[PDB]
Amino acid sequence: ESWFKKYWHLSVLVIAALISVKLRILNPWNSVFTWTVRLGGNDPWYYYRLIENTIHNFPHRIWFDPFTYYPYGSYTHFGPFLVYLGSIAGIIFSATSGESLRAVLAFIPAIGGVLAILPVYLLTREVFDKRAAVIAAFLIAIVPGQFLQRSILGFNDHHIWEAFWQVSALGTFLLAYNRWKGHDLSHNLTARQMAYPVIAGITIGLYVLSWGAGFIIAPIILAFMFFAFVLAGFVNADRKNLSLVAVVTFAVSALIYLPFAFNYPGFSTIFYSPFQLLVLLGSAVIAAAFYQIEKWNDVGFFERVGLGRKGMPLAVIVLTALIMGLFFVISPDFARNLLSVVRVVQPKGGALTIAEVYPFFFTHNGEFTLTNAVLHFGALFFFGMAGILYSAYRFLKRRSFPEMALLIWAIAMFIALWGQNRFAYYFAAVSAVYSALALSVVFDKLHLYRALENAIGARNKLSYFRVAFALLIALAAIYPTYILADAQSSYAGGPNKQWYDALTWMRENTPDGEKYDEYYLQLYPTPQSNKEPFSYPFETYGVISWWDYGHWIEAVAHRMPIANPFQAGIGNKYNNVPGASSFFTAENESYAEFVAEKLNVKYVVSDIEMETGKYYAMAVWAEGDLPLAEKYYGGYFYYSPTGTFGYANSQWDIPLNSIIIPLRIPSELYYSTMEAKLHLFDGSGLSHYRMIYESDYPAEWKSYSSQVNLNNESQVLQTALYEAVMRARYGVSPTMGTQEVLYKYAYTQLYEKKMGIPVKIAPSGYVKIFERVKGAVVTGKVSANVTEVSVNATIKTNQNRTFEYWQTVEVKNGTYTVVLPYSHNSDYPVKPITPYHIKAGNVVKEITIYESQVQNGEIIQLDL
Numbered sequence: 001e002s003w004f005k006k007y008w009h010l011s012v013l014v015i016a017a018l019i020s021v022k023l024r025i026l027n028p029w030n031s032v033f034t035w036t037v038r039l040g041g042n043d044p045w046y047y048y049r050l051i052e053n054t055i056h057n058f059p060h061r062i063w064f065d066p067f068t069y070y071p072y073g074s075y076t077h078f079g080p081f082l083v084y085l086g087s088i089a090g091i092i093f094s095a096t097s098g099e100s101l102r103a104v105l106a107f108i109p110a111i112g113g114v115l116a117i118l119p120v121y122l123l124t125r126e127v128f129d130k131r132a133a134v135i136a137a138f139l140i141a142i143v144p145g146q147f148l149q150r151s152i153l154g155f156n157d158h159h160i161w162e163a164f165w166q167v168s169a170l171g172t173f174l175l176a177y178n179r180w181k182g183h184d185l186s187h188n189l190t191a192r193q194m195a196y197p198v199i200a201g202i203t204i205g206l207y208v209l210s211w212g213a214g215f216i217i218a219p220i221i222l223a224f225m226f227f228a229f230v231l232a233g234f235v236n237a238d239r240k241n242l243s244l245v246a247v248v249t250f251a252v253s254a255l256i257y258l259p260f261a262f263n264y265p266g267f268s269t270i271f272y273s274p275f276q277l278l279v280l281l282g283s284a285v286i287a288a289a290f291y292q293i294e295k296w297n298d299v300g301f302f303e304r305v306g307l308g309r310k311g312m313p314l315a316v317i318v319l320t321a322l323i324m325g326l327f328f329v330i331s332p333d334f335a336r337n338l339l340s341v342v343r344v345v346q347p348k349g350g351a352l353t354i355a356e357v358y359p360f361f362f363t364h365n366g367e368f369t370l371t372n373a374v375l376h377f378g379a380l381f382f383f384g385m386a387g388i389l390y391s392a393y394r395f396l397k398r399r400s401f402p403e404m405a406l407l408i409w410a411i412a413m414f415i416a417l418w419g420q421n422r423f424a425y426y427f428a429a430v431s432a433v434y435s436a437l438a439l440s441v442v443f444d445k446l447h448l449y450r451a452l453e454n455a456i457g458a459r460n461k462l463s464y465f466r467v468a469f470a471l472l473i474a475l476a477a478i479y480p481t482y483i484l485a486d487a488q489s490s491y492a493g494g495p496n497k498q499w500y501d502a503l504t505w506m507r508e509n510t511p512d513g514e515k516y517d518e519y520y521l522q523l524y525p526t527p528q529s530n531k532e533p534f535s536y537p538f539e540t541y542g543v544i545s546w547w548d549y550g551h552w553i554e555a556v557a558h559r560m561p562i563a564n565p566f567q568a569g570i571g572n573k574y575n576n577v578p579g580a581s582s583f584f585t586a587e588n589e590s591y592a593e594f595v596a597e598k599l600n601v602k603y604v605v606s607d608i609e610m611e612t613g614k615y616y617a618m619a620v621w622a623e624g625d626l627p628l629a630e631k632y633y634g635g636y637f638y639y640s641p642t643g644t645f646g647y648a649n650s651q652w653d654i655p656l657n658s659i660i661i662p663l664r665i666p667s668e669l670y671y672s673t674m675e676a677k678l679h680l681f682d683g684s685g686l687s688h689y690r691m692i693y694e695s696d697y698p699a700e701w702k703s704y705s706s707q708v709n710l711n712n713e714s715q716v717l718q719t720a721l722y723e724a725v726m727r728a729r730y731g732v733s734p735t736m737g738t739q740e741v742l743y744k745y746a747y748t749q750l751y752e753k754k755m756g757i758p759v760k761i762a763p764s765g766y767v768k769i770f771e772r773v774k775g776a777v778v779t780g781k782v783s784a785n786v787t788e789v790s791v792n793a794t795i796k797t798n799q800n801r802t803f804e805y806w807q808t809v810e811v812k813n814g815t816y817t818v819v820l821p822y823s824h825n826s827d828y829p830v831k832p833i834t835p836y837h838i839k840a841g842n843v844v845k846e847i848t849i850y851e852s853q854v855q856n857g858e859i860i861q862l863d864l
């Protein structure tokens with residue numbers, strides 16, 4: 001004494017900050033800074049593109065990226081706030097690219113998470129008191145879920161800054177109301193008390209300057225005033241000052257958003273358009289409108305004209321029935337855009353999956369559960385909700401304004417939370433703030449503060465018995481939350497070493513390698529439209545793969561992806577739009593080529609996820625609906641009571657007591673699709689596609705081969721099945737590596753004909769890359785008569801792995817005509833180690849083609 005006081009309420013913050021640093025920075029550290037600076041997720045990799053570019057052309061940033069969504073290019077909705085900030089931090093730290101720049105950016109979100117303590121404290125202090133604000137500031141440092149996972153080290157996305165500035169906005173706003181509250185003109189603003197509404201304005205503008213839909217904060221604040229007016233006889237507030245701090249706030253923000261408000265041709269809620277500029281500027285006038293109504297109410301306007309107690313309420317109703325009712329006149333657009341947020345146009349979709357849009361509190365299909373709330377908010381959700389239900393009584397009793405506004409804010413975020421899993425990170429602060437209020441009561445009425453006060457060092461009349469329970473309760477709110485958090489912050493996302501190495505390879509092993517690096521940094525102009533292919537300054541080629549890996553390919557390999565994580569370039573079959581879905585799920589080879597030529601596809605990257613688990617999604621996207629995607633899959637594997645290899649065509653034929661395998665064995669159509677031909681058969685039975693790179697074996701299988709030979713099918717089928725069942729005793733599906741072996745195994749024992757493009761039974765590479773090629777046409781007269789010409793060759797990968805390439809042609813008019821993709825003297829690490837041993841009848845030759853024919857499609861003649 002007196003220390004700790006008033007450093008006690010300051011120490012805990014520092015304690016909380018250090019806990020955040022422990023979670024955000026220390027825990028994932030070894031997973032972020034590994035073989036390279038490993039930015040997690042997909043989104044944060046795009047900023048590594050946007051920052052690196054904006055660094056080169058400071059202080060100007062791009063607003064259209066023709067590098068992705070090949071060959072159309074997609075607009076960038078990623079806000080200028082992080083882009084500039086990430087670039088500002090980039091140049092200051094004297095690092096402008098590569099692993100030197102990623103290392104700097106990795107800290108940006110973590111800092112945001114630790115710094116997120118302040119605005120929560122400020123917000124909580126303004127609607128409640130300083131003792132509850134402390135707890136909220138502490139709980140915010142340990143709240144898990146998306147709010148933690150997207151504030152971790154290396155995950156440089158714009159999500160953490162949404163919540164930060166949002167909470168900053170509400171807090172600073174309510175701060176502005178509180179400092180003005182009561183003080184009439186002209187005490188306010190007068191320089192000193194102008195900072196509060198101005199700062200609030202800066203906060204809001206900053207929010208929208210980081211997230212396009214940030215304008216949604218505007219009606220929320222309008223919603224505050226709305227209920228503040230219509231309940232004038234039920235709730236007390238300085239509506240004069242409320243309106244005055246509102247009109248200033250929106251104006252400043254609009255003034256701040258203005259220089260960034262014309263980066264999109266037309267109105268939009270996502271891209272930086274003058275739409276958002278309208279919402280702020282509008283609400284400012286709407287705010288200023290509330291002023292005159294109140295000042296009119298002062299001199300009893302609604303009392304003179306005979307309206308009574310319900311004068312101003314019904315007045316505002318109409319005045320809000322109008323304005324935001326005449327907005328439907330000119331020009332919507334606008335009205336149709338504001339409605340677009342409200343009118344939640346679900347069900348998806350779909351084509352959705354998706355992963356996010358699935359509602360919180362509703363499993364996946366489709367019961368009710370709180371498991372999502374637990375895994376994302378720990379104990380803070382249940383203390384949070386309970387904290388709200390209490391706050392919804394303090395307002396029914398004391399009827400305070402800022403407590404109501406916090407409730408409204410809490411209501412909205414829950415509504416948004418209820419709709420889709422995507423928006424968990426907006427409810428973290430809600431759960432943190434309201435749990436504090438819950439605990440703050442528990443602490444006060446179960447004494448605790450006495451001791452504390454009378455611990456050091458007074459004398460109060462307390463019960464030590466209550467104090468213990470108050471501590472036991474705090475434990476129940478802090479332990480499982482932190483435990484969850486400590487476990488979720490221990491792993492960092494991002495591409496695996498199979499993907500990074502393979503992409504760094506493509507970076508420095510593909511044509512025009514110097515052109516891209518030069519185009520990767522050029523400040524692109526902003527096209528009025530982008531439905532047309534982009535006019536490229538050189539001979540650009542496109543890389544195709546599932547849209548998940550669009551950002552990785554662009555940021556790491558420095559090439560042009562057909563599809564990006566913006567859900568663009570996916571395409572479909574139900575309308576034949578050339579995309580990734582219509583490509584990998586293509587039935588024949590011609591359809592694949594149809595799409596490929598439509599998009600100037602040159603390289604194709606496939607992985608084991610696309611071969612297995614993610615394939616279903618590609619089918620749904622392509623087909624357009626889940627019932628249509630069912631035909632790609634068939635029956636299940638099973639092992640009877642006797643323990644025997646089993647496959648049942650129907651879900652009926654499954655023996656009783658038989659233990660199944662949680663894995664849907666694909667149908668015949670699947671093996672007759674591009675994704676399987678490419679990955680499962682390693683580019684066999686194909687005319688225009690040759691393999692050029694292979695990642696290492698999928699994780700565990702490399703660890704498997706520490707005591708198992710890979711070519712020995714009997715020694716690989718053993719452990720494959722062995723794992724497949726030992727895991728199947730539990731509810732878990734086998735490893736993706738093992739998922740591949742079974743797909744091979746099923747194919748051979750089932751859908752493979754007498755010899756329909758056969759294959760081996762062995763694990764492959766996690767990531768594979770193929771080059772689209774014309775192919776050396778090989779024609780000539782047969783040995784009349786004969787029916788088929790079967791060409792085969794042994795092919796070695798860059799992992800010492802060796803499969804077999806095949807192709808068989810229909811002989812018509814005595815002249816066969818085969819197209820061969822692989823070449824011999826290529827500088828690609830995947831070269832065939834044997835010549836094409838062709839055969840037509842009992843007569844057989846042996847050709848040896850080179851790239852000058854293969855890539856140029858030179859016709860070579862061969863008779864027999």
Ligand SMILES: [Mn+2]
Binds near residue numbers: 159
């Ligand atoms: Mn994101």
